[PDB]
Design an enzyme around this catalytic site. Structure first.
Site, PDB file in Angstrom:
ATOM      1  CE  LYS A 146      17.722  59.690  74.475  1.00 25.62           C
ATOM      2  NZ  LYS A 146      17.884  59.368  73.029  1.00 25.62           N
ATOM      3  CB  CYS A 176      23.699  60.723  74.499  1.00 27.73           C
ATOM      4  SG  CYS A 176      22.713  62.067  73.859  1.00 27.73           S
ATOM      5  CD  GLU A 227      32.450  47.235  60.023  1.00 23.06           C
ATOM      6  OE1 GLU A 227      32.755  48.048  59.120  1.00 23.06           O
ATOM      7  OE2 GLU A 227      31.991  47.577  61.141  1.00 23.06           O
ATOM      8  CG  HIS A 241      24.747  48.721  61.181  1.00 23.90           C
ATOM      9  ND1 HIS A 241      25.922  48.130  61.593  1.00 23.90           N
ATOM     10  CD2 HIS A 241      24.386  49.571  62.172  1.00 23.90           C
ATOM     11  CE1 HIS A 241      26.256  48.603  62.780  1.00 23.90           C
ATOM     12  NE2 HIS A 241      25.341  49.479  63.154  1.00 23.90           N
TER      13      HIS A 241
HETATM   14  N1  LIG Z   1      30.224  51.805  77.114  1.00 21.69           N
HETATM   15  C1  LIG Z   1      30.009  51.912  75.788  1.00 21.69           C
HETATM   16  N2  LIG Z   1      30.249  53.092  75.156  1.00 21.69           N
HETATM   17  C2  LIG Z   1      30.037  53.238  73.798  1.00 21.69           C
HETATM   18  C3  LIG Z   1      29.561  52.165  72.993  1.00 21.69           C
HETATM   19  C4  LIG Z   1      29.323  50.944  73.684  1.00 21.69           C
HETATM   20  O1  LIG Z   1      28.866  49.850  72.990  1.00 21.69           O
HETATM   21  N3  LIG Z   1      29.551  50.845  75.051  1.00 21.69           N
HETATM   22  N4  LIG Z   1      29.324  52.285  71.587  1.00 21.69           N
HETATM   23  C5  LIG Z   1      29.620  53.677  70.949  1.00 21.69           C
HETATM   24  C6  LIG Z   1      29.458  54.127  69.534  1.00 21.69           C
HETATM   25  N5  LIG Z   1      28.386  55.209  69.356  1.00 21.69           N
HETATM   26  C7  LIG Z   1      27.043  55.158  69.702  1.00 21.69           C
HETATM   27  C8  LIG Z   1      26.255  56.310  69.431  1.00 21.69           C
HETATM   28  C9  LIG Z   1      24.864  56.341  69.768  1.00 21.69           C
HETATM   29  C10 LIG Z   1      24.245  55.214  70.379  1.00 21.69           C
HETATM   30  C11 LIG Z   1      22.742  55.234  70.755  1.00 21.69           C
HETATM   31  O2  LIG Z   1      21.877  54.818  69.959  1.00 21.69           O
HETATM   32  N6  LIG Z   1      22.487  55.704  72.002  1.00 21.69           N
HETATM   33  C12 LIG Z   1      21.154  55.803  72.642  1.00 21.69           C
HETATM   34  C13 LIG Z   1      21.111  55.096  74.000  1.00 21.69           C
HETATM   35  C14 LIG Z   1      21.567  53.638  73.874  1.00 21.69           C
HETATM   36  C15 LIG Z   1      21.542  52.911  75.204  1.00 21.69           C
HETATM   37  O3  LIG Z   1      20.421  52.537  75.618  1.00 21.69           O
HETATM   38  O4  LIG Z   1      22.650  52.729  75.788  1.00 21.69           O
HETATM   39  C16 LIG Z   1      20.705  57.273  72.796  1.00 21.69           C
HETATM   40  O5  LIG Z   1      19.749  57.630  72.067  1.00 21.69           O
HETATM   41  O6  LIG Z   1      21.304  57.993  73.631  1.00 21.69           O
HETATM   42  C17 LIG Z   1      25.021  54.056  70.649  1.00 21.69           C
HETATM   43  C18 LIG Z   1      26.401  54.024  70.315  1.00 21.69           C
HETATM   44  C19 LIG Z   1      30.102  54.744  71.751  1.00 21.69           C
HETATM   45  N7  LIG Z   1      30.300  54.487  73.168  1.00 21.69           N
END
Ligand SMILES: Nc1nc2c(c(=O)[nH]1)NC(CNc1ccc(C(=O)N[C@@H](CCC(=O)O)C(=O)O)cc1)CN2
Ligand SMILES: N[C@@H](CCS)C(=O)O
Ligand SMILES: [Zn+2]
Ligand SMILES: [Zn+2]
EC number: 2.1.1.14
Length: 746
Positions: free
Chosen positions: A17, A508, A657, A687
Site C-alpha cells: 500500500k 482499501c 447524482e 470530485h
Molecule cells: N464502511 C464503508 N465502506 C465503504 C465506503 C464507505 O464510505 N464506508 N465507500 C466505498 C467505495 N470505495 C472506496 C475505495 C477506496 C477508498 C480510499 O481512499 N481508501 C483509503 C482509506 C480511507 C479511510 O481512511 O477510510 C485507503 O487508501 O485505503 C475509499 C472508498 C467502499 N466501502
C-alpha cells in the site's frame, strides 16, 4: 489436493500500500519497490506451500490490477500514452493505472458484483497487440527458483475481451469478440514460455461464463480453446469461474472446451451448479470444489464441506476432486492473526485469507484420511458457539414476524397529497437549495462537546449567511465513516483491527462486521441533529445511512439471507427517524449510496434484490408524519434500468447524482413513469476540485426545468463536500444558489 484461486496483493499490514504510494510520491524508486513486491511475493508462496497447498497460484500478485496486468501482456496500451513497443515497465504501467500530469488515467469499473474495481481495457480494430509483459513467466520462474512450483493464473482470452470496451471512434457496431484472433496468438506465446520454463498446469480465469451469455458468445469460448488446444498439449488446464452458478448452457460449452482438463466452480455462491454436475460431468476431468468462501470472513463449516466434497468424491473422487477457495482470496482480508482487540469467541468465528489457506487443507487431508481431529473438534465447537451464543439470536429477531404484516408503504398519503402538508409546515421557494451531508475538514485533532459544537455552529453560521440554502445540514463532523458511525452504535457490529480488503490501486476499505441481529437500543443521531436545528430558523436535514448501504459495505453473516439482516437494520433505523421527528427535525435525508451494489449477477435475480432492498428503505420512514419530509440519497447517474425501484422507495424528494450526464436522461421520470415527487439531481461536481459557474449551473438547472417538472425540482451538490477544500466549495456553492434566484425571478 488443495488449491487457492487467488491471493491478496497488499500485505498483512498493507506493505505494498505504502510501497506503491511511496514510489508515486517520488520518495523511492523502482529497485526499492521491486524489492518490496518480490519480497512479499516470496513470503506468500512460502506461506502457501508450507501449509500443504498443492496448487499454488503465481501471477495473482499485481502492482494495481489483474486485467491491466493482462492489458500489458497483450501490449494493448492506449495511444495517448505514447507506447512505442518493447517490454512494458513501471512507467507505462502506472500511467494507464493512475495517469500522469499531461494525460488522464484509464477508466475503472466494478469487478463483477464485488467491491473491487478493475481497469477496463480500451479495445478496437486498430490496436497493435504484442507480447509486452513477461510478468507471468517471470513470476513462475521466480517461484520455482525459490523451491516452489506454481500455477500461472491468466485472465481468459474471451472473458478479457468481453470485460473490455471499444475505445472512442470504434464505430458502435464493432464487436469486441472480433479480436479473439489478434490476442490469441499472444496467449499462445505466453502459454508456450510457461511450458518451456517447466509449468505443468495453467489457469485461465473465465469468470464471464457465470454471466448471462447469449449462445453466440458462449460459442466464442469454444472457438478460442479450439484454437488453443495444440499449444495446450501436454499441460493441465484449469478454467476458473466464480461469484455465481453456471447457466446450463454455459455448463455445456465449459465442460466441452478443448485442452481444458479441470474446471473451477464457486460452490458457495454457485451451489446451483451442483445439479448440472450431479447430472453429468466429463470423465477424467478435475473438479476444483470451491467450498471455502474466499469472499467473506467467517470460519468454514468443515463438516458441511466434507459432506459436499465427499459426494463430489462420489461423482469422481478417483483423484480428480480438488478442494479450493470459492474465489480469489483477494476479496477477503489477509491475517486474522493481526486481530487483537477482537475478543476470543468472536474471532473463533472468523477466518481471514491466511486462515482460509489452511482450511482448504484440513479439508483436503480429511478427504484423504488425514483428518486432523484437533481442527474439526475446535471448528465444530466454534460453530456450536455461534449458533448458540445470545450475542447472536435475539427478541429483536421477533419484531420480524410482524414485518410480515403486508408490505410497509408510507401510510397511504400519496406522496402528492403529502407534499401539500410538508410544504405547509415549511414554506420553501421553488428550486430549494441544499447540500448532501458531509463537509470539508480543518485542523482536525484525532471536552469533545465544547469542541464539537465550535465546529458545527460554524458549519451552520456559514450555511445561513452563505447562499441562504433553503435547507441546511450539520456537516457530519462527529462521523468519520458514515457506515462505521452507526455500526459502533449498534448491536450486531464488531470491528476488526487489521481486517482490510482492497478496493482499487493502493486503496482499501476495512468493512464493519455484522455478526448478530442488528439493534439500536439507544439514540444515535438526535443529539447532534437536534443541537443543530436550534442554531437556525431554517429546515435542517437530519442525517441517516440507509440500511442497504450499511449491509452491503460490511461483512454480513453467512448464516441468514442478506435481506433478513438488512431488514433487522432497517427496523433499527426506523427509530432514529421517528426520534429526529420527535426531536423536532422536520426534513430528514436517508441515503442509499450502495443500493445497486448488491445487485446479483444473474438477471432473473435482480428482481428479488431490488425488492427487499427498496422495501427496507420504506420500513425506515413508514411510521413518519405527513408533514415530515424525507429525502433519499443515492450515488448514481443511471437509474434507467432501475427507475421503477426509485419510484417505489416513496421519497418525497429524492436526491441522486448527475453533474456530468444529460439533461434529457431525466425524462426517465417524465415518461411512462410519471414520478411526481421532489427530485434533485446534482449541479456541481465535487470530485472536480474546480469551482463551477453561476452561469453554468442556472442553465443546466434550466435544462431540468424543461426536462423534468420544475415544481418538484431541487438544487443540491453531487454528493457530500467532505473531500473538497473550503476554498473549492465556498465560491462553488454560492454560485449554485444565485442560479435558483435568477431562474426563479422570471
Ligand atoms: N464502511 C464503508 N465502506 C465503504 C465506503 C464507505 O464510505 N464506508 N465507500 C466505498 C467505495 N470505495 C472506496 C475505495 C477506496 C477508498 C480510499 O481512499 N481508501 C483509503 C482509506 C480511507 C479511510 O481512511 O477510510 C485507503 O487508501 O485505503 C475509499 C472508498 C467502499 N466501502
Ligand atoms: N451524505 C453522506 C453519504 C453520501 S455517500 C456523505 O456525504 O458522506
Ligand atoms: Zn452520493
Ligand atoms: Zn413496483
Amino acid at each position: 489436493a488443495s488449491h487457492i484461486v487467488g491471493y491478496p496483493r497488499m500485505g498483512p499490514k498493507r506493505e505494498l500500500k505504502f510501497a506503491l504510494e511511496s514510489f508515486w510520491d517520488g520518495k523511492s524508486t523502482a529497485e526499492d519497490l521491486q524489492k518490496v513486491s518480490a519480497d512479499l511475493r516470496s513470503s506468500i508462496w512460502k506461506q502457501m506451500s508450507a501449509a500443504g497447498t498443492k496448487f499454488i497460484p503465481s501471477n495473482t500478485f499485481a502492482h494495481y490490477d489483474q486485467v491491466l496486468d493482462t492489458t500489458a501482456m497483450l501490449g494493448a496500451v492506449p495511444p495517448r500514452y505514447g507506447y512505442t513497443g518493447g517490454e512494458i515497465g513501471l512507467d507505462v504501467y502506472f500511467s494507464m493505472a493512475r495517469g500522469n500530469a499531461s494525460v488522464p488515467a484509464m477508466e475503472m469499473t466494478k469487478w463483477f458484483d464485488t467491491n473491487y474495481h478493475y481497469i477496463v481495457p480500451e479495445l478496437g480494430p486498430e490496436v497493435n497487440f504484442s507480447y509486452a509483459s513477461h510478468k507471468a513467466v517471470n513470476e513462475y520462474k521466480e517461484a520455482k527458483a525459490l523451491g516452489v512450483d506454481t500455477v500461472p493464473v491468466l485472465v481468459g482470452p474471451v472473458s478479457y475481451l468481453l470485460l473490455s470496451k471499444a475505445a472512442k471512434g470504434v464505430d458502435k457496431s464493432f464487436e469486441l469478440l472480433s479480436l479473439l484472433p489478434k490476442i490469441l496468438p499472444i496467449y499462445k506465446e505466453v502459454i508456450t514460455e510457461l511450458k518451456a520454463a517447466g509449468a505443468t498446469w495453467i489457469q485461465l480465469d473465465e469468470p464471464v461464463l457465470v454471466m448471462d451469455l447469449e449462445g453466440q458468445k458462449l460459442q466464442a469460448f469454444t472457438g478460442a480453446y479450439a484454437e488453443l488446444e495444440s499449444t495446450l498439449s501436454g499441460l493441465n488446464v484449469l478454467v476458473e469461474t466464480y461469484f455465481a452458478d453456471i447457466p446450463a448452457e454455459a455448463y455445456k460449452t465449459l465442460t466441452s472446451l478443448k485442452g481444458v482438463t479441470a474446471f473451477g466452480f464457486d460452490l458457495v455462491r454457485g451451489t446451483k451448479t451442483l445439479d448440472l454436475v450431479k447430472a453429468g460431468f466429463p470423465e477424467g476431468k478435475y473438479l476444483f470444489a470451491g467450498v471455502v468462501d474466499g469472499r467473506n470472513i467467517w470460519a468454514n463449516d468443515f463438516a458441511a464441506s466434507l459432506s459436499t466434497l465427499q459426494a463430489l468424491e462420489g461423482i469422481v473422487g478417483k483423484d480428480k476432486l480438488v478442494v479450493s477457495t470459492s474465489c480469489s482470496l483477494l476479496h477477503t482480508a489477509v491475517d486474522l492473526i493481526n486481530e487483537t482487540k477482537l475478543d476470543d469467541e468472536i474471532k473463533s468465528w472468523m477466518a481471514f485469507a491466511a486462515q482460509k489457506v489452511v482450511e482448504v487443507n484440513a479439508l483436503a487431508k480429511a478427504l484423504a484420511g488425514q483428518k486432523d481431529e484437533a481442527l474439526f473438534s475446535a471448528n465444530a465447537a466454534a460453530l456450536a458457539s455461534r449458533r448458540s451464543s445470545p450475542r447472536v439470536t435475539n427478541e429483536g429477531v421477533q419484531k420480524a414476524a410482524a414485518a410480515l404484516k403486508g408490505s410497509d408503504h408510507r401510510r397511504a398519503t400519496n406522496v402528492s397529497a403529502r407534499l401539500d402538508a410538508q410544504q405547509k409546515k415549511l414554506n420553501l421557494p421553488i428550486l430549494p437549495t441544499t447540500t448532501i451531508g458531509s463537509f470539508p475538514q480543518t485542523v482536525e485533532l484525532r471536552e469533545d462537546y465544547v469542541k464539537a459544537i465550535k465546529e458545527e455552529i460554524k458549519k451552520v453560521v456559514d450555511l445561513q449567511e452563505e447562499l441562504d440554502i433553503d435547507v441546511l445540514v450539520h456537516g457530519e463532523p462527529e462521523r468519520n465513516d458514515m457506515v462505521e458511525y452507526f455500526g459502533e452504535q449498534l448491536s450486531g457490529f464488531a470491528f476488526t483491527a487489521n481486517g482490510w480488503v482492497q478496493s482499487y490501486g493502493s486503496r482499501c476499505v476495512k468493512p464493519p462486521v455484522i455478526y448478530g441481529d442488528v439493534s439500536r437500543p439507544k439514540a444515535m443521531t438526535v443529539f447532534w441533529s437536534a443541537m443543530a436545528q436550534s442554531m437556525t430558523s431554517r429546515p435542517m436535514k437530519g442525517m441517516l445511512t440507509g440500511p442497504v448501504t450499511i449491509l452491503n459495505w460490511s461483512f454480513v453473516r453467512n448464516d441468514q439471507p442478506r435481506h433478513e439482516t438488512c431488514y433487522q437494520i432497517a427496523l433499527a433505523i426506523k427509530d432514529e427517524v421517528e426520534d429526529l421527528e420527535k426531536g423536532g427535525i422536520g426534513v430528514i435525508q436517508i441515503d442509499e449510496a450502495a443500493l445497486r451494489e448488491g445487485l446479483p449477477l444473474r438477471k432473473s435475480e435482480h428482481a428479488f434484490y431490488l425488492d427487499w432492498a427498496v422495501h427496507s428503505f420504506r420500513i425506515t420512514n413508514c411510521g413518519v408524519q405527513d408533514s415530515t419530509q424525507i429525502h433519499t440519497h443515492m450515488c448514481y447517474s443511471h437509474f434507467n434500468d432501475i427507475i421503477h425501484s426509485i419510484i417505489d422507495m416513496d421519497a418525497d424528494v429524492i436526491t441522486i447524482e448527475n453533474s456530468r450526464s444529460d439533461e434529457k436522461l431525466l425524462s426517465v421520470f417524465r415518461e411512462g413513469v410519471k414520478y411526481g415527487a421532489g427530485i434533485g439531481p446534482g449541479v456541481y461536481d465535487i470530485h472536480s476540485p474546480r469551482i463551477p459557474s453561476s452561469e453554468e449551473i442556472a442553465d443546466r438547472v434550466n435544462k431540468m426545468l424543461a426536462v423534468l417538472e420544475q415544481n418538484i425540482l431541487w438544487v443540491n451538490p453531487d454528493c457530500g463536500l467532505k473531500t473538497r477544500k473550503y476554498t473549492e466549495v465556498k465560491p462553488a456553492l454560492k454560485n449554485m444558489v444565485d442560479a435558483a434566484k435568477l431562474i426563479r425571478s422570471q
